């Protein structure tokens, strides 16, 4: 079960890396094995102080245990943080690493599991709350106060592992956070509504 | 080849449009449809992914060509010049009536 | 109710020095309203966290948003990448 589970992950990450070549990047040992929140600060320590991800499977660095897929998680996150800081934020390979990181993390998060408010004082008094919660990373836009137009911008495609300071092409820009809307969907109207007889 | 200028901006759709199904004469890029810049009236269910490239050898009649033929007869009810370019312009007048009957 | 509003505006000052990430005209598109962030497109219409059957106060911190998105297994994707070539 876990033997194919190393092979099926490996067969995807080689074939899903032809346009971006993250897996064939020059990657040293980089033995941190720390908190994944520390995975760049220990690497920033590694830059100040001083075997690739394809060759990690080939050297058998990854065992059929959680730690063998934790190092598989640790070494992948090290390469993408190298490649995000290498490229500027507008190049195609910056977002190609950003697209490959989001896919490979989504591939590793699953399949290892297979193997104070007056409104709340009324509703919890009135209802029974079966609950479900989760985390989501939001994006940002710009905010411009022009002459009563109150302009907005598009979504900046800066990755979540960029960690660069807030530069501004204009200081009269304001910056706003776009909260993502997620719930049960409002019921779409029927097919007679969309495509009626005109 | 036609050009398909994206609605609610001035960009050009490269090879794929998001044809509105209630405005029925507007197209969108993927980016203008991803972030919901088509105005608060439309509900993102009245947007069929349509393509802008030239199709294969003729008398094939893909469902994009079939629906865009079916939109025009609901639009115009005549003027098979105005139906044939609505299919994409790569189909003759003599073939759309031969397809419709 | 009109359809032909502009909703896309361009400031005349060419500030295209640090702007390679945003949406350009080819100048910067400045829309009338903000963006829409959607988590997932395909919903899982089964999955009794959402279906709510009428049989039998509990919380459940599910792992991420990817439970409700219909993803396939890597075993078949390896079975399909072997079906690739």
């Amino acid at each position: 079960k876990l033997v194919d589970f190393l092979v099926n992950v490996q067969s995807i990450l080689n074939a899903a890396s032809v346009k971006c070549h993250v897996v064939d990047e020059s990657f040293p040992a980089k033995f941190f094995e720390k908190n994944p929140d520390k995975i760049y600060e220990s690497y920033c320590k590694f830059i100040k102080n001083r075997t690739t991800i394809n060759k990690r499977f080939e050297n058998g660095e990854y065992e059929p245990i959680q730690g063998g897929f934790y190092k598989l998680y640790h070494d992948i996150k090290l390469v993408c943080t190298i490649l995000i800081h290498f490229y500027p934020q507008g190049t195609r390979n910056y977002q190609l690493v950003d697209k490959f990181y989001k896919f490979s993390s989504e591939l590793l998060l699953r399949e290892c599991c297979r193997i104070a408010t007056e409104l709340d004082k009324i509703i919890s008094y009135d209802f029974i709350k079966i609950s479900m919660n989760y985390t989501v990373p939001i994006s940002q836009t710009y905010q411009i106060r022009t002459k009563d137009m109150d302009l907005f911008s598009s979504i900046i495609s800066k990755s979540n592992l960029d960690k660069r300071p807030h530069e501004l092409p204009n200081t009269n820009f304001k910056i706003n956070n776009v909260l993502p809307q997620t719930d049960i969907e409002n019921e779409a109207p029927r097919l007679g509504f969309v495509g009626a007889n005109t | 080849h036609k050009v398909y200028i994206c609605h609610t901006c001035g960009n050009e759709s490269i090879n794929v449009r998001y044809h509105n199904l209630r405005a029925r004469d507007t197209n969108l890029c993927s980016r203008c449809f991803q972030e919901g810049h088509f105005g608060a009236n439309f509900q993102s269910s009245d947007f069929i992914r349509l393509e802008n490239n030239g199709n294969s050898v003729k008398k094939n009649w893909s469902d994009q060509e079939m629906l865009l033929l079916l939109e025009g007869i609901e639009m115009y009810e005549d003027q098979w010049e105005k139906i044939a370019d609505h299919v994409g312009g790569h189909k003759r007048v003599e073939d759309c009536i031969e397809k419709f009957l | 109710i009109m359809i032909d509003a502009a909703s896309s505006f361009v400031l005349p000052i060419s500030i295209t020095k640090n702007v390679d990430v945003l949406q350009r005209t080819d100048e910067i598109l400045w829309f009338r309203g903000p963006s829409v962030i959607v988590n997932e497109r395909i919903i899982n219409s089964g999955d009794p966290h959402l279906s709510l059957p009428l049989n039998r106060n509990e919380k459940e911190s599910l792992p991420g948003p990817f439970v409700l998105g219909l993803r396939p297994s890597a075993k078949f994707t390896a079975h399909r990448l072997s079906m690739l070539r």
């Binding site: 411009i144 | 001035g10 004469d25 507007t26 | 032909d4 361009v10 400031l11």
Partner: peptide, 29 residues
């Protein structure tokens, strides 16, 4: 910067739908 009324980009719906991309049809000299 708040006296910087921007340029509206008009779509002109007929240009959005079906504009194609005359001496090259040689019947007019």
């Amino acid at each position: 910067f708040e006296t910087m009324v921007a340029n509206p980009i008009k779509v002109s719906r007929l240009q959005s739908n079906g504009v194609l991309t005359i001496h090259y049809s040689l019947a007019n000299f």
